[PDB]
Protein backbone atom coordinates (compact mmCIF):
# COMPACT_ATOMS: atom_id res chain seq x y z
CA UNK A 1 0.00 0.00 0.00
CA UNK A 2 1.01 3.66 0.25
CA UNK A 3 1.19 6.03 3.20
CA UNK A 4 -2.07 7.92 3.64
CA UNK A 5 -1.95 11.74 3.60
CA UNK A 6 -3.46 12.10 7.08
CA UNK A 7 -0.58 11.82 9.59
CA UNK A 8 1.66 10.60 6.81
CA UNK A 9 3.62 7.86 8.57
CA UNK A 10 1.42 4.78 7.96
CA UNK A 11 -1.82 3.16 9.05
CA UNK A 12 -1.71 1.93 12.66
CA UNK A 13 -2.44 -1.66 11.54
CA UNK A 14 0.73 -2.65 9.65
CA UNK A 15 4.50 -2.23 9.24
CA UNK A 16 6.56 -0.12 6.80
CA UNK A 17 8.36 -2.16 4.14
CA UNK A 18 10.80 -0.22 1.98
CA UNK A 19 10.90 -1.14 -1.69
CA UNK A 20 12.69 -0.35 -4.95
CA UNK A 21 10.69 1.28 -7.75
CA UNK A 22 12.08 2.16 -11.17
CA UNK A 23 10.63 5.33 -12.70
CA UNK A 24 9.19 4.42 -16.12
CA UNK A 25 11.19 1.70 -17.90
CA UNK A 26 14.27 3.18 -19.60
CA UNK A 27 15.20 5.38 -16.63
CA UNK A 28 16.73 3.45 -13.73
CA UNK A 29 15.57 6.01 -11.15
CA UNK A 30 15.79 4.07 -7.90
CA UNK A 31 13.81 6.29 -5.55
CA UNK A 32 13.50 3.94 -2.58
CA UNK A 33 9.93 4.87 -1.70
CA UNK A 34 8.63 4.48 1.85
CA UNK A 35 5.39 2.51 2.03
CA UNK A 36 3.80 0.14 4.54
CA UNK A 37 2.40 -3.31 3.79
CA UNK A 38 0.45 -6.08 5.52
CA UNK A 39 -0.69 -9.63 4.83
CA UNK A 40 -0.15 -13.06 6.37
CA UNK A 41 3.58 -13.76 6.69
CA UNK A 42 4.24 -10.32 8.18
CA UNK A 43 1.87 -11.10 11.06
CA UNK A 44 3.88 -14.22 11.91
CA UNK A 45 7.05 -12.15 11.56
CA UNK A 46 5.76 -9.60 14.07
CA UNK A 47 4.70 -12.33 16.48
CA UNK A 48 8.09 -14.03 16.19
CA UNK A 49 10.01 -10.77 16.62
CA UNK A 50 8.03 -10.05 19.79
CA UNK A 51 9.15 -13.34 21.37
CA UNK A 52 12.74 -13.27 20.06
CA UNK A 53 13.44 -9.51 20.45
CA UNK A 54 15.30 -8.71 17.24
CA UNK A 55 15.00 -5.62 15.08
CA UNK A 56 14.55 -5.69 11.32
CA UNK A 57 14.80 -3.36 8.32
CA UNK A 58 13.19 -5.47 5.62
CA UNK A 59 13.05 -4.69 1.91
CA UNK A 60 11.27 -6.13 -1.10
CA UNK A 61 13.01 -8.15 -3.80
CA UNK A 62 14.13 -6.17 -6.85
CA UNK A 63 14.84 -8.42 -9.85
CA UNK A 64 12.65 -11.38 -10.74
CA UNK A 65 10.03 -13.12 -8.65
CA UNK A 66 10.24 -16.23 -6.45
CA UNK A 67 13.43 -18.12 -7.40
CA UNK A 68 14.95 -20.17 -10.19
CA UNK A 69 18.35 -21.67 -11.01
CA UNK A 70 18.64 -19.77 -14.28
CA UNK A 71 22.11 -20.37 -15.80
CA UNK A 72 23.40 -21.59 -12.39
CA UNK A 73 22.63 -18.15 -10.85
CA UNK A 74 19.50 -17.67 -8.76
CA UNK A 75 17.30 -14.58 -8.87
CA UNK A 76 14.74 -13.44 -6.33
CA UNK A 77 14.92 -14.03 -2.61
CA UNK A 78 17.04 -17.14 -3.21
CA UNK A 79 19.64 -15.05 -5.02
CA UNK A 80 19.78 -12.67 -2.06
CA UNK A 81 20.27 -15.35 0.60
CA UNK A 82 22.59 -17.48 -1.55
CA UNK A 83 24.77 -14.36 -1.86
CA UNK A 84 24.70 -13.63 1.90
CA UNK A 85 22.99 -10.33 1.10
CA UNK A 86 19.90 -10.67 3.31
CA UNK A 87 19.19 -13.06 6.17
CA UNK A 88 15.62 -14.42 6.22
CA UNK A 89 13.37 -14.63 3.15
CA UNK A 90 9.93 -14.57 4.78
CA UNK A 91 7.29 -15.16 2.14
CA UNK A 92 5.31 -17.77 0.26
CA UNK A 93 8.25 -20.10 -0.37
CA UNK A 94 7.77 -23.73 -1.38
CA UNK A 95 10.06 -26.44 -0.01
CA UNK A 96 12.08 -28.17 -2.72
CA UNK A 97 14.98 -30.61 -2.67
CA UNK A 98 17.20 -28.43 -4.87
CA UNK A 99 16.21 -25.39 -2.80
CA UNK A 100 16.96 -27.32 0.39
CA UNK A 101 20.28 -28.42 -1.11
CA UNK A 102 21.23 -24.81 -1.87
CA UNK A 103 19.80 -22.94 1.14
CA UNK A 104 18.65 -24.33 4.48
CA UNK A 105 14.97 -24.27 5.42
CA UNK A 106 13.00 -24.38 8.65
CA UNK A 107 10.11 -26.65 9.60
CA UNK A 108 6.76 -25.83 7.95
CA UNK A 109 3.81 -24.13 9.60
CA UNK A 110 1.19 -24.02 6.82
CA UNK A 111 0.67 -27.03 4.56
CA UNK A 112 0.01 -26.79 0.82
CA UNK A 113 0.81 -28.57 -2.43
CA UNK A 114 -0.22 -29.10 -6.03
CA UNK A 115 -3.92 -28.59 -6.76
CA UNK A 116 -6.07 -28.74 -9.89
CA UNK A 117 -8.32 -25.76 -10.67
CA UNK A 118 -11.09 -27.03 -12.96
CA UNK A 119 -14.72 -26.12 -12.33
CA UNK A 120 -18.22 -26.42 -13.78
CA UNK A 121 -19.19 -23.97 -16.52
CA UNK A 122 -22.87 -24.16 -15.55
CA UNK A 123 -19.61 -36.27 -9.43
CA UNK A 124 -16.17 -34.68 -9.62
CA UNK A 125 -15.21 -33.13 -12.95
CA UNK A 126 -11.83 -34.86 -13.31
CA UNK A 127 -10.59 -36.16 -9.93
CA UNK A 128 -7.42 -37.53 -11.50
CA UNK A 129 -3.80 -36.42 -11.64
CA UNK A 130 -2.28 -39.31 -13.63
CA UNK A 131 -5.66 -39.70 -15.31
CA UNK A 132 -6.57 -41.00 -18.75
CA UNK A 133 -7.30 -37.53 -20.14
CA UNK A 134 -4.29 -35.50 -18.99
CA UNK A 135 -1.67 -38.06 -19.97
CA UNK A 136 -2.22 -37.95 -23.77
CA UNK A 137 -4.76 -35.16 -24.38
CA UNK A 138 -4.09 -34.61 -28.09
CA UNK A 139 -6.28 -37.50 -29.28
CA UNK A 140 -9.11 -36.93 -26.79
CA UNK A 141 -11.58 -34.10 -27.53
CA UNK A 142 -10.29 -30.59 -28.33
CA UNK A 143 -7.18 -30.02 -26.19
CA UNK A 144 -7.79 -28.46 -22.79
CA UNK A 145 -6.19 -25.22 -21.64
CA UNK A 146 -3.43 -25.34 -19.02
CA UNK A 147 -2.82 -22.78 -16.31
CA UNK A 148 0.93 -22.51 -15.76
CA UNK A 149 3.60 -19.85 -15.34
CA UNK A 150 7.34 -19.84 -16.16
CA UNK A 151 9.80 -19.78 -13.26
CA UNK A 152 7.55 -21.36 -10.64
CA UNK A 153 7.37 -24.55 -8.60
CA UNK A 154 4.65 -26.80 -10.02
CA UNK A 155 5.85 -26.57 -13.62
CA UNK A 156 9.34 -27.84 -12.76
CA UNK A 157 7.90 -30.84 -10.90
CA UNK A 158 5.53 -31.64 -13.76
CA UNK A 159 8.33 -31.33 -16.32
CA UNK A 160 10.74 -33.59 -14.42
CA UNK A 161 7.94 -36.07 -13.69
CA UNK A 162 6.47 -36.37 -17.20
CA UNK A 163 7.53 -33.66 -19.69
CA UNK A 164 4.89 -34.68 -22.27
CA UNK A 165 2.17 -32.99 -20.23
CA UNK A 166 4.62 -30.12 -19.73
CA UNK A 167 5.39 -30.26 -23.47
CA UNK A 168 1.74 -29.59 -24.24
CA UNK A 169 1.35 -27.12 -21.35
CA UNK A 170 4.11 -24.95 -22.83
CA UNK A 171 1.50 -23.98 -25.44
CA UNK A 172 -0.41 -21.91 -22.85
CA UNK A 173 1.63 -19.65 -20.56
CA UNK A 174 0.18 -16.87 -18.39
CA UNK A 175 1.62 -13.65 -16.99
CA UNK A 176 -0.29 -12.97 -13.78
CA UNK A 177 -2.29 -15.11 -11.36
CA UNK A 178 -5.34 -12.91 -11.94
CA UNK A 179 -4.81 -13.11 -15.71
CA UNK A 180 -5.21 -16.89 -15.64
CA UNK A 181 -8.37 -16.60 -13.52
CA UNK A 182 -9.83 -13.96 -15.84
CA UNK A 183 -9.05 -16.07 -18.91
CA UNK A 184 -10.64 -19.12 -17.26
CA UNK A 185 -13.77 -17.14 -16.43
CA UNK A 186 -13.93 -15.73 -19.97
CA UNK A 187 -13.61 -19.25 -21.42
CA UNK A 188 -10.10 -18.94 -22.86
CA UNK A 189 -8.79 -21.21 -20.07
CA UNK A 190 -10.23 -24.42 -18.61
CA UNK A 191 -7.68 -26.01 -16.25
CA UNK A 192 -5.21 -24.41 -13.85
CA UNK A 193 -2.42 -26.14 -11.90
CA UNK A 194 -0.79 -24.16 -9.09
CA UNK A 195 -0.14 -24.17 -5.35
CA UNK A 196 -3.09 -25.50 -3.37
CA UNK A 197 -3.17 -22.76 -0.73
CA UNK A 198 -3.40 -19.79 -3.09
CA UNK A 199 -6.02 -21.46 -5.29
CA UNK A 200 -8.04 -22.32 -2.18
CA UNK A 201 -7.81 -18.72 -0.96
CA UNK A 202 -8.87 -17.34 -4.34
CA UNK A 203 -11.80 -19.75 -4.67
CA UNK A 204 -12.95 -19.16 -1.10
CA UNK A 205 -13.57 -15.44 -1.63
CA UNK A 206 -14.64 -15.69 -5.27
CA UNK A 207 -17.52 -13.42 -6.26
CA UNK A 208 -20.46 -15.82 -6.19
CA UNK A 209 -18.26 -18.96 -5.94
CA UNK A 210 -18.93 -19.85 -9.57
CA UNK A 211 -15.71 -21.91 -9.60
CA UNK A 212 -14.86 -24.95 -7.47
CA UNK A 213 -11.56 -26.83 -7.47
CA UNK A 214 -11.28 -30.20 -9.20
CA UNK A 215 -10.93 -32.34 -6.07
CA UNK A 216 -12.77 -32.23 -2.75
CA UNK A 217 -9.78 -31.23 -0.64
CA UNK A 218 -7.26 -33.52 -2.35
CA UNK A 219 -3.57 -32.78 -2.88
CA UNK A 220 -0.86 -34.45 -4.96
CA UNK A 221 2.51 -33.01 -3.84
CA UNK A 222 1.84 -32.13 -0.19
CA UNK A 223 4.61 -29.80 1.00
CA UNK A 224 4.25 -26.91 3.41
CA UNK A 225 5.64 -23.39 3.27
CA UNK A 226 8.65 -22.17 5.22
CA UNK A 227 11.26 -19.49 5.74
CA UNK A 228 14.67 -19.67 4.07
CA UNK A 229 17.72 -19.30 6.30
CA UNK A 230 21.43 -18.82 5.66
CA UNK A 231 23.38 -22.08 5.81
CA UNK A 232 24.51 -22.55 9.40
CA UNK A 233 22.88 -19.38 10.70
CA UNK A 234 22.58 -19.36 14.53
CA UNK A 235 18.82 -18.82 14.32
CA UNK A 236 17.43 -22.24 13.37
CA UNK A 237 16.74 -23.73 16.80
CA UNK A 238 15.22 -20.60 18.36
CA UNK A 239 12.77 -19.80 15.56
CA UNK A 240 11.95 -23.48 15.04
CA UNK A 241 11.03 -24.05 18.68
CA UNK A 242 9.17 -20.73 18.79
CA UNK A 243 6.87 -21.56 15.90
CA UNK A 244 6.41 -25.12 17.15
CA UNK A 245 5.13 -23.58 20.38
CA UNK A 246 2.97 -21.23 18.30
CA UNK A 247 1.34 -24.11 16.42
CA UNK A 248 0.95 -25.96 19.72
CA UNK A 249 -0.92 -23.13 21.43
CA UNK A 250 -3.28 -22.48 18.51
CA UNK A 251 -2.22 -18.98 17.47
CA UNK A 252 -1.70 -20.12 13.87
CA UNK A 253 -5.23 -21.56 13.80
CA UNK A 254 -6.68 -18.30 15.14
CA UNK A 255 -4.78 -16.26 12.55
CA UNK A 256 -5.92 -18.62 9.78
CA UNK A 257 -9.54 -18.30 10.91
CA UNK A 258 -9.25 -14.50 11.00
CA UNK A 259 -7.45 -14.32 7.63
CA UNK A 260 -7.61 -17.60 5.66
CA UNK A 261 -11.40 -17.63 5.46
CA UNK A 262 -13.41 -17.58 2.25
CA UNK A 263 -16.62 -15.82 1.31
CA UNK A 264 -18.95 -18.81 0.89
CA UNK A 265 -16.71 -21.93 0.88
CA UNK A 266 -18.34 -24.25 3.42
CA UNK A 267 -21.41 -21.99 3.74
CA UNK A 268 -23.54 -24.01 1.34
Amino acid sequence: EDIDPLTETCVRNTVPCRKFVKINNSTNEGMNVKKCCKGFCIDILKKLSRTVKFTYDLYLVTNGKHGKKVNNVWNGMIGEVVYQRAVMAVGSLTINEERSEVVDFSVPFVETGISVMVSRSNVDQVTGLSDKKFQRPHDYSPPFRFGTVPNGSTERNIRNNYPYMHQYMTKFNQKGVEDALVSLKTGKLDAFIYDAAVLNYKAGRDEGCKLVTIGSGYIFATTGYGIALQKGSPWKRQIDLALLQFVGDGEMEELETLWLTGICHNEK
Binding site: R205, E207, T261, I263
Partner: peptide, 20 residues
Protein backbone atom coordinates in the same frame (compact mmCIF):
# COMPACT_ATOMS: atom_id res chain seq x y z
CA UNK B 1 -34.35 -18.93 2.33
CA UNK B 2 -32.59 -15.70 3.30
CA UNK B 3 -30.93 -15.66 6.72
CA UNK B 4 -30.88 -13.03 9.45
CA UNK B 5 -27.50 -11.29 9.66
CA UNK B 6 -26.03 -11.58 13.17
CA UNK B 7 -24.57 -8.07 13.17
CA UNK B 8 -20.84 -7.62 12.79
CA UNK B 9 -20.52 -11.12 14.29
CA UNK B 10 -21.71 -12.31 10.88
CA UNK B 11 -18.58 -12.92 8.77
CA UNK B 12 -20.41 -11.66 5.67
CA UNK B 13 -20.94 -8.33 7.42
CA UNK B 14 -17.31 -8.63 8.55
CA UNK B 15 -16.03 -8.72 4.96
CA UNK B 16 -17.50 -5.91 2.82
CA UNK B 17 -18.83 -6.80 -0.62
CA UNK B 18 -19.76 -4.67 -3.62
CA UNK B 19 -23.40 -5.80 -3.44
CA UNK B 20 -23.51 -4.98 0.31
Amino acid sequence: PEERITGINDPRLRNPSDKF
